[PDB]
């Protein structure tokens, strides 16, 4: 585990000692690797920057440059945390707590998302030690990648107004059913802006010279549309692909460079990496020993290493 | 209301001096290259 401890610094509200008991299996973001550390850098008051608190995109950027840690065992003197970034060498598969409305799967990669849900705030309050605690919500990673694209684009609509007030909310989610509504309260600009620029600048490099030949086959896409099932379902209705349909540009130097093969490389370099440069890295994977295929809300799932 | 305009036109005409004086900075200049290397040809 390469054991790391966090002590109980000063006093105890006597029911709130039991509040630390039911947080077993949650995640602490501690911005270090320590053998002992105070509880002051733990809470959300440390997540608050100079003067201002981060938004749910800034908390992504706040959870960027800190280190997650697993609650292992809860003492009245200390709390032993295992440093996820290094000390994931656990054949004992140190256990986590699922605090999420989604019943997951077996075999999901699990990445951490700030509490942004309408009813799972994960707000526990300490008044003897005046601190506020937001636990991250562990979620499956495609469902995690369906969230971060919404919240930045919702903040993309925070730059430009123009349109009438009835906008698509980006606030109805879909997992097999299960209509989810999240919170849209505040959108800090710099958390939107720096997230928007890497969405711009990576999509710059992901276009290359041999990429341009693919753009010719855009009318070839709709030729498969009215003659099969798979393509017509692949072609989205709310897509620009159905909108843009309504050429080599020769410039041929040398022609032994494999121009089409080189196109799919650098496109995958930056447009292939769009979930992980915006959000947190997944290192938690669902692995139950008993053959249980799903893990209930509130359960203690065994946790294995990087996916 | 006139005194601002009658000053601002006067400041323009004061600036239009050196707008024209620097434009008239070629009248002792445009003559040397059109006379001097032509006379030693006559020589």
């Amino acid at each position: 585990c390469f054991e790391a401890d966090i002590a109980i610094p000063s006093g105890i509200s006597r029911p709130d000692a039991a509040a630390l008991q039911r947080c077993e299996g949650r995640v602490v973001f501690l911005p270090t690797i320590r053998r002992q550390l105070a509880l002051a850098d733990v809470a959300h008051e440390s997540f608050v920057s100079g003067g201002v608190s981060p938004d749910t995109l800034g908390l992504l950027l706040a959870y960027r440059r800190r280190f997650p840690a697993v609650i292992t065992r809860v003492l009245p003197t200390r709390i032993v945390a295992c440093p996820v970034d290094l000390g994931l060498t656990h054949a004992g598969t140190v256990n986590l707590r699922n605090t999420s409305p989604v019943d997951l799967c077996n075999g999901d990669p699990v990445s951490l998302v700030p509490p942004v849900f309408e009813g799972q705030a994960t707000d526990v309050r300490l008044e003897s030690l005046d601190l506020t605690l937001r636990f991250p919500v562990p979620l499956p990673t495609p469902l995690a990648r369906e969230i971060v694209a919404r919240l930045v684009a919702r903040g993309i609509r925070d730059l430009n107004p123009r349109t009438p007030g009835e906008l698509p909310d980006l606030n109805v989610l879909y997992y097999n059913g299960a209509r989810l509504s999240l919170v849209a309260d505040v959108q800090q600009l710099a958390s939107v802006n720096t997230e928007l620029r890497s969405l711009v600048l990576n999509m710059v490099y992901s276009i290359t010279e041999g990429t341009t030949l693919i753009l010719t086959l855009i009318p070839r896409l709709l030729a498969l549309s009215a003659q099969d099932g798979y393509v017509n379902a692949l072609l989205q209705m709310q897509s620009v692909t159905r909108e843009a349909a309504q050429a080599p540009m020769l410039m041929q130097d040398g022609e032994r460079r494999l121009p089409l093969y080189e196109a799919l490389v650098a496109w995958l370099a930056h447009a292939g990496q769009l979930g992980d440069i915006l959000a947190l890295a997944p290192a938690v994977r669902v692995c139950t020993f008993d053959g249980a295929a799903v893990v209930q809300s509130g359960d203690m799932a065994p946790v294995i290493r990087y996916p | 209301e006139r005194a601002a305009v009658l000053q601002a036109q006067r400041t323009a005409a004061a600036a239009a001096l050196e707008n024209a004086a620097l434009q008239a900075a070629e009248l002792p200049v445009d003559i040397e290259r059109r006379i001097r290397p032509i006379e030693q040809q006559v020589h």
Binding site: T32, R34, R65, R257, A266, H270, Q273 | -
Partner: protein, 279 residues
């Protein structure tokens, strides 16, 4: 299982670990007889791909492969060969006074040409010469080699930490990043910083010093650089050299084996990591 051994049989045409120290940060030479082909491929055609066809071919002139393949590249062999390249001269060049008096610049001069030729046709020296380890034993013969230089996690610097103490081999190397100092553990990485057609295909080898995650290292790779002035692209690759789980045991010395500045680093979790090169 927190103790491992690895072994590769190569020549002493490369590193000559008998001429090295007990602690050296060895590279392999994976794909050793490679790169006439990838000289031709992966590059735009304004690079004149007939250069690396001869360039590595002059390297093994200084060094027929036989049954002992060319490998086990030293840590010294890149620092001194790029000593004339990157922004340190007469101090990085002391690594050349370390090599040519103990190892040979004949093999450097063919390879410093490769360091202008590999980077020329976009055949970048990351993902070739992959990490091998810290030179545990040197059971080599006279002109041949048989080295055990274990990979495989923290055990290289425990089984040379319960006893080589991991030099940095140049004080210019071990880049003192994070002068904003605090307590914790050190996270070591292997970055090749480039300059493409500005300094005519620059080569660089140095180790960074950070208490930073891989997600807090890429923006740290965009900041602190002055070699952005390029446009081709895909500069500044890096992999994980692993964790030094102590910032207290770093040192500052100039005594080795020619007086070469050197940094003692005791106790390292050698997480072998993975490379990344896109921008």
């Amino acid at each position: 299982p927190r103790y491992h051994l690895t072994r590769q049989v190569t020549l002493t045409d490369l590193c000559q670990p008998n001429a090295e120290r007990a602690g050296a940060l060895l590279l392999a030479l994976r794909h050793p007889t490679d790169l006439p082909h990838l000289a031709r491929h992966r590059a735009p055609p304004g690079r004149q791909t007939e250069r690396l066809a001869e360039a590595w071919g002059q390297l093994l002139e200084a060094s027929e492969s036989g049954c002992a393949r060319a490998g086990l590249v030293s840590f010294n062999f890149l620092v001194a060969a790029c000593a004339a390249a990157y922004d340190a001269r007469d101090a990085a060049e002391a690594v050349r006074a370390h090599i040519t008096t103990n190892y040979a610049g004949a093999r450097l001069d063919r390879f410093s040409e490769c360091l202008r030729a590999m980077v020329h046709t976009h055949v970048f020296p990351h993902e070739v010469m992959r990490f091998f380890g810290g030179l545990v034993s040197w059971v080599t013969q006279d002109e041949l080699a048989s080295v055990t230089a274990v990979c495989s996690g923290p055990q290289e610097a425990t089984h040379t930490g319960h006893p080589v103490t991991i030099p940095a081999c140049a004080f210019v190397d071990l880049d003192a990043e994070l002068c904003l100092g605090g307590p914790g553990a050190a996270f070591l990485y292997l970055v090749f910083t480039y300059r493409q057609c500005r300094d005519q295909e620059l080569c660089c080898v140095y180790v960074v010093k950070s208490q930073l995650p891989p997600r807090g290292l890429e923006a740290a790779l965009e900041r602190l650089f002055g070699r952005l002035r390029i446009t081709t692209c895909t500069y500044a690759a890096f992999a994980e050299l692993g964790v030094m789980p102590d910032d207290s045991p770093r040192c500052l010395h100039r005594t080795e084996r020619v007086g070469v500045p050197v940094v003692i680093l005791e106790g390292v979790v050698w997480r072998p990591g993975g490379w990344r090169a896109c921008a």
